[PDB]
Structure formats: structure tokens, C-alpha cells
Amino acid sequence: VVAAAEKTKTKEGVLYVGSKTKEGVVHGVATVAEKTKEQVTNVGGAVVTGVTAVAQKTVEGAGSIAAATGFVK
Amino acid sequence: VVAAAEKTKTKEGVLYVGSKTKEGVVHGVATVAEKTKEQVTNVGGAVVTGVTAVAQKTVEGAGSIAAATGFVK
């Protein structure tokens, strides 16, 4: 499991957000197990969670994610 | 499982968001197991979750995701 990232090197990249929520419940990244034997979970990269979620320009630079998730029996 | 990303190198990339929610419930990334033996889960890359979700310009730079998810028995 190898990840390699290389980077070699007027409004730009500007965000305005206004949010008005009376009630918010946000769970993000959740793993829940009840009465479970084996649970393997991988979350990788960018997760944005919100009642109001904005992601801008998340990977201008190179980004690498490598995942190997699981079990050997 | 190998990921490689390489990058070699007027309004641009500008977002305006207004959001008004009375009630919000957001779950993001969730794995739930009840009474399960084997659960393997991989989430990779960008997940944006929201009552109002905006993703802009998520990978201008090179992005790589490699996943190998599972089990050998």
C-alpha cells in the first residue's frame, strides 16, 4: 500500500458562505458496530460534512490515496 | 495498491453560497453493522455531504485513489 505525491513548480480561490440553521445534527465519519464479529473500515481523503458543506480546490497539488482494507483468514 | 500523483508546473475559482435550513441532519460517511460477521468497507476520495453541498474544482492537480478492499479465506 504505497501512495506517492509529487508537486514541482483578480480573485482566485475565493469563497463566501453564509449559513443560517435553526437546528443541526451532523455525523461526520462514523463506524458503528452492534453485536458484530469483524468490521474493517477505512476512510481516506477529504470528507467534508455539514448542514452546509463547501469544498473548494481540494487537491490543486497532486494527491494520492492508497488503501488496502480487509482480512485474511 | 499503489497510487501515484504528479503535478508539474477576472474571477477564477470563486464560490458564493447562502444556505438557510430550519432543521438539518447529515450523516457523512457511515458504516453500520448490526449482527454481522464480516464487513469490509473503504471510502476514498472526496465526499462532500450537506443539506447544501458544494464541491468546486476538487482535483485541478492530479489526484489518484487506489483501493483494494476485501477478504481472502
Place this chain on the structure above:
Amino acid sequence: VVAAAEKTKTKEGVLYVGSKTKEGVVHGVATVAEKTKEQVTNVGGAVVTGVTAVAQKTVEGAGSIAAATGFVK
């Protein structure tokens, strides 16, 4: 499990956010186990959680995530 990142080297990258929430519950990253034998969980990279979540320019520089999650029996 190897990750390598290399970086070699008017409004830019500017965010305005206004948020008004009466009630907020946010869970971020959560792993919950009730009555579970084996739970393996990896969270990698950037997670932004919020009633109002903004991510801007998260990886201009190179970013690498490598994960190997699981069990051998």
C-alpha cells in the same frame, strides 16, 4: 504502508463564512462498538465536520495517504 509526498518550488485563497445556528450537535469522527468482537477502523486525510463546514485549498502541496487496515487470522 508507505506514503511519500514531495513539494519542490488580487485575492488568492480567501474565505468569508458567516454562520448562525440555534442548536448544533456535531460528531466529527466516531467509532462506536457495542457488544462487538473485532473492529478495526482507520480514518485518514482531512475530515471537516460542521453544521457549517468549509474546506478550501486542502492539498495545494502534494499530499499522500496510505492505509492498510485489517486483520490476519
Place this chain on the structure above:
Amino acid sequence: VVAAAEKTKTKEGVLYVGSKTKEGVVHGVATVAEKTKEQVTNVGGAVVTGVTAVAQKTVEGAGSIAAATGFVK
């Protein structure tokens, strides 16, 4: 499990946030186990949690996360 990061080397990178919340509960990163035998959990990288969460320019420099999470039996 090896991570290597190398870096070699008008408003830029400016954020304004205003937040008004009457009530906030935020959980950040949480692992909860009730009645569980084996729970292995790794959280890596940047997690921002909030009723109002902003992440700007999180990895301009190179960033590497490597994780090996799990058990051998």
C-alpha cells in the same frame, strides 16, 4: 509504516469567520466501546470539527500519512 514528506523552496490565505450559536455540542474524534472485546482505531491527518468548521490551505507543504491498523492472530 513509513511516511516521508519533503518540501524544498493582495490578500493570500486570509479567512474571516463569524459564528453565532446558541447551543453547541461537538464530539471531535471519539472511540467508544461498550462490552467489546477488540477495537483498534487509528485517526490520522487533520480533523476539524465544529458547529462552524473551516479548514483553509491544510497542506500547502507536502504531507504524508501512513497507517497500518489492525490485528494479527
Place this chain on the structure above:
Amino acid sequence: VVAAAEKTKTKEGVLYVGSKTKEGVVHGVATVAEKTKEQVTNVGGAVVTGVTAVAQKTVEGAGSIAAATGFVK
């Protein structure tokens, strides 16, 4: 488990935040075990938690996190 980081070398990097919360409960990073036999948990990197959380420019310099979390039986 080895991490190596190397760094070799108008408003820039400026944040304004105003927050007004009547009530706040924030949990940061928490591991809770009730009645559990084995719980292994690693949190790495930067976690920002708040009713109002801002992270700006978290890793301009190179940053590496390496984690090996788990048990051998």
C-alpha cells in the same frame, strides 16, 4: 513506524474569527471504554475541535504521520 519530514528553504496567512455561543460542550479527542477487554486507539496529526473551529495553513512545511496501531496475539 518511521516518519521523516524535511523542509529546505499584502496580507498572507491572516484569520479573523468572531464567535458568540451561549452554551458550548466540546469533547476534543476521547476514547471511552466501558466493560471492554482490549481497545487500542491512536490519534495523530492535528485535530481542531470547537463550537467554532478554524484551521488555517496547517502544514505549509512538510508533515509526516506514521501509525501502526493494533495487537498481535
